Structures are given as C-alpha cells and as structure tokens.
C-alpha cells in the first residue's frame, strides 16, 4: 500500500496550490483520516490538516483540505513566501499509518535555473591506489529539485550510486553531488560513463572516457 | 504536553538502537497512542509504530522483526528499540502523541492524527570510530579543478585553497553520507584557463575530529 503524491510543486506569492495524496489500495475515503503535515526547512513536522479537513488551531486559514477524485487533496490558498517546504499526507490502513513520499513547494523568487553540470572521472592517483569514484557537480539550479541518473555505457548504473538532496547556496540556487564508485576494472571496462541531471523535464549529460 | 526524546547519537552497525521519550503535561496512562517517526537526512518522513498505555502495538511492516515498543508508566515514558541496525538506520528519530477517542468505556479509534511532536533527535549508525579523508586531485581537461575527499567520519572537514589565499570562485559541496556509514565530499575551484601553466593550486584539507591536515596539489594532467 504505496501513498503517492507530487514530487515538487511551484507558486507564485499570493498563488494557489493544491497537493493530492493518492493510495495504491484504492480511493481515498474518510475512514484513512487522511491527515497533512507541513515540514519548514530544519523543523519538527506540523499537522496542519487531519480527518480529510480539520484544522489544528495553529492552522492559518489559507490552508484547507478535501477529498477530491478517490485522492486527498490540501490546497492552499493567497501563498506567502514562509510557506515553502516540504508537505506530507499521511492515511491509515486498519491501524497502520503510512507516510507519503512528501512534496516539495517552491514559492517562487527568482527566475528559473537550469543546473551547471561537471563530471570528473577517476583521477590517477585514486586508480593507482586501486580505487575508483566518479563525482558528477550540479550546481546553481531554481527550484532545488533534480533527479540524477547514471550510464555505464549506454546501460543504467544502480550499485554505487549515492547522491546528496539540494542545498541551498549562497546566491539562493542549488547544489548538489552524485557520487558513482566502481572498481579500476569497471571503469577500465567501458569506453565511457556519463551522468545525466534531470531538471524540471530537461535532462543534461556529462560524459567522460578512460 | 511535550515530548523529550533521548539516547545515544551514536550506533555501531548489527547494534541496537534505543531511545526514550519522557512525557510531561499529561500522564503515559491516558487517551493517547505514543509514536515513533523517523526520517534519514533529506528523505522523507517514515512511521515506526505507535503503542497504547494497555500494551497495544502496531508497528510498520517493514520494520516488524526488529522493533520493539514499550510503555514505563514508571518514569511516564515510552520507548523504541530496534535491532541489527545498518546505515540505513541512520535518521532523526521523532516522538509524537496522537489521542484516541473513545466516546465508549473501550473503543479504539482514527478520528485524530499526530498532533504534537518531540523535537527530535539525530542517530548516526556507522562502523567507524573516527576515520581520516583520502584526498584525490580532480584535474582540469575558464577551467574547473577540485579536489575529492572520500570516507571520512565523523562529519566536519573543511577545505581551502592555497592556504586561503584564494578566495573567489571557490565552491565547496556539502557531504553525502554513503551507505557504508562513511562521508564523502568535494570542492571545486573556477580558474582562468591561460593560468593553469604557472599558478599552483593546492586544496588544503582539514578533518577536526582526527586532527588531520592533507595538502594536495591539482595539476593539469
């Protein structure tokens, strides 16, 4: 039983935006109490919604929740910059409370940015210690959600893959890192690896050779 | 009402975990469900378990082996334990209370979500006690080179260039923490190409906990 919600969402100050919290067993109904938690960025998580749509008395008014299509919706309306961050619906399955993946909300403040990307293969001292690690940099990016995928070859790399979530710079833009360890002989093995930067649908590739 | 939660900070991999929350403003012994939520550094949230006064648990079943949740009317506290702990263990770890109405002398109900939350508190599961950086020179093929530190723990390095000499264009990553308990993390510099024939550049790395120092120089292979 699998809650899916939007992976990130943007507004403009005094916008409207609604999240949708959908399960994989079937509709949504009020017998899940599906339940919204609002996390700020370095906070606790804060109910704002529960039981469909019942306010905390910490609640502000511009926060309001419905069921809407078989999915749990929580819209929010005249969008102040403070309300960014990242919100989770919550359901209950004969006693089992289940978390959404959570989305992220960007309220918007600067123009959008794609992401610089530079890869760096193994250096020589690292092969000559017997060791390997490719380093994809993705920097100055807005908003500060990016998926990283890896190719050895033409072939998608799972193993070895970790990758940091965005932080924010100095300038209000986003970094982030991606990390591909692999044996000499991996690398040695292929005639390139690339990494591939996804960023609001647009995808940039670094590629490089041993 | 508000909820205290504390243990350890550190685990040693295949160990238990445990934490404790203390209550106060209302007693382990009323109308409430006790939870656990965690969450690993940048991912979301997820939920533990949760345990009435009487000795009813749930827990998540992906967790169900090896939790175990217990209430201590004792000392008005509640406690998580988990088993055979890995990286994957590694989280802020929340107490959080949820009431159950029982309009009935005994009915358990879902009509209210967590509604008040500890503030939290951060568990590292690693292997390692304290463990220097390797540092690799990231060559340039303007012009950016860096410098890559790998595996080191606990957390804090930091990096200069040339000493600090050089200021500008400097951009140092934030760390990943890898699944082998162990962080990772990189800096790089913007140069101007038509200097890469006659200024040094040397990345100057410095990991308090283990008093390390490392300089290495990045060329142009």
């Known amino acids: 039983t699998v809650v899916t919600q939007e992976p990130s969402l943007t507004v403009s100050p005094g916008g409207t935006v609604t999240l949708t919290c959908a399960s994989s067993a079937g509709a949504v109904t009020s017998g899940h109490c599906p339940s919204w938690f609002q996390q700020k960025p370095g906070q606790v998580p804060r109910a704002l919604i529960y039981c469909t749509n019942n306010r905390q008395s910490w609640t502000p008014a511009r926060f309001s929740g419905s069921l809407r299509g078989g999915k749990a919706a929580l819209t929010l309306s005249g969008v102040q910059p403070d309300d960014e961050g990242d919100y989770y619906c919550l359901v209950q399955y004969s006693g089992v409370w289940v978390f959404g993946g959570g989305t992220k909300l960007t309220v918007l403040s600067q123009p959008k940015a794609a992401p610089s990307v530079t890869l760096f293969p193994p250096s020589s001292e690292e092969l000559q210690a017997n060791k390997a690690t490719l380093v994809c940099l993705i920097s100055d990016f807005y908003p500060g959600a990016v998926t990283v995928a890896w190719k050895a070859d033409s072939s998608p790399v799972k193993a070895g893959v970790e990758t940091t979530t965005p932080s924010k710079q100095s300038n209000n833009k986003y970094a982030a890192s991606s990390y591909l360890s692999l044996t000499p002989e991996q690398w040695k093995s292929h005639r390139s690896y690339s990494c591939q930067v996804t960023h609001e649908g647009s995808t940039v590739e670094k590629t490089v050779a041993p | 009402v508000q909820l205290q939660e504390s243990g350890p900070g550190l685990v040693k991999a295949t160990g238990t975990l445990s934490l404790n929350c203390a209550v106060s403003?209302?007693?382990?012994?009323?109308?409430?469900?006790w939870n656990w939520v965690r969450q690993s550094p940048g991912k979301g949230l997820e939920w533990i378990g949760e345990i009435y006064h009487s000795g009813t648990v749930t827990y998540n079943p992906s967790l169900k082996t090896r939790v175990t949740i217990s209430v201590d009317k004792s000392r008005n506290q509640f406690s998580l334990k988990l088993t055979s702990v890995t990286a994957a263990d590694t989280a802020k770890y929340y107490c959080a209370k949820r009431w159950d109405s029982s309009g009935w002398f005994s009915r358990h109900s879902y009509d209210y979500a967590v509604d008040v939350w500890g503030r939290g508190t951060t568990v590292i599961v690693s292997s390692a006690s304290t463990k220097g950086p390797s540092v690799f020179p990231l060559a340039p093929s303007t012009a950016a080179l860096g410098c890559l530190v790998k595996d080191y723990f606990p957390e804090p390095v930091t990096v200069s260039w040339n000493s600090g000499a050089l200021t500008s264009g400097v951009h140092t990553f934030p760390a990943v923490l890898q699944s082998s308990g162990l962080y990772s993390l990189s800096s790089v510099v913007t140069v101007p190409s038509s200097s890469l024939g006659t200024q040094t550049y040397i990345c100057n790395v410095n990991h308090k906990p283990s008093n390390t120092k490392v300089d290495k120089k990045v060329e142009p292979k």
């Open positions: 403003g209302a007693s382990i012994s009323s109308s409430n469900w």
